A paper describes a structure:
[name] is part of the nisin resistance operon. [name] belongs to the OmpR/PhoB family of RRs.
The structure of the [name]-RD was determined at a resolution of 1.8 Å. The asymmetric unit contains two copies of [name]-RD. Superimposition of the structures revealed that helix α4 is slightly rotated outward in [name]-RD. Furthermore, helix α4 in [name] is shorter than in other RRs. However, the structure of [name]-RD did not contain any divalent ion. Instead, a water molecule is present, which interacts with Glu12 of the acidic pocket, Lys104, and another water molecule in the vicinity.
Numbering used by the authors:
A (entry chain A), B (entry chain B): 4 to 120
Write the structure that this text describes.
């Protein structure tokens, strides 16, 4: 009965890192097929999505707006240190929060805790 | 046809129409291999890029940010009339203007003339 987190990320290092860390406290799944994310989300029923918006061949901006037609669950963006994002931007893009790479797991933990309640 | 325009677009109908319309005034190229877009842009050396930011599996904002590490040329985003794209977003993501599908060719022509001036 742990909270379910779905991770949209193509970097297997990052995915492994997050699965290792978060699995103690959450049911964590990552994308299997990037062309099937709507079905994967319908089937998995996550409580929260971690959405990397820096993936070259998965348009995180497009897909967040598409998912927002259907979902009210929190979406936390994973952004780049390079990129300069803020909460106004995150909200206008359909997100609830953001965290920039490279990030501390401690900061991610605090954000996950606060948001999931 | 001296000005060079590169179009990042996977709708082949839009590419065909734009190539045909712009042929009179511009040297126009589009994507040959979506795995090699950055390299094609480096090879073609456009004066302007039309970057569709609605492609589900090519992250237009990511690639604009990558291109902005070494190009200062104008980039006009192609968006969708029902999405949340506005000028604040266009400029914040490294673009210089945007045009929303479906769009007027007269508006595109005016935008191209103005920003290539």
């Amino acid at each position: 009965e742990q909270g379910k987190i779905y991770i949209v990320e193509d970097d297997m290092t990052i995915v492994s890192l997050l699965k290792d860390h978060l699995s103690a406290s959450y049911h964590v799944s990552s994308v299997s097929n990037f062309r099937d994310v709507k079905q994967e989300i319908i089937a998995f029923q996550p409580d929260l999505i971690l959405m990397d918006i820096t993936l070259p061949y998965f348009n995180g901006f497009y897909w967040t707006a598409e998912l927002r037609k259907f979902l009210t669950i929190p979406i936390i963006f994973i952004s780049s240190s390079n990129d300069e994002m803020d909460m106004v931007m995150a909200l206008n893009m359909g997100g609830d929060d953001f965290i920039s790479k490279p990030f501390s797991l401690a900061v991610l933990d605090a954000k996950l805790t606060a948001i999931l309640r």
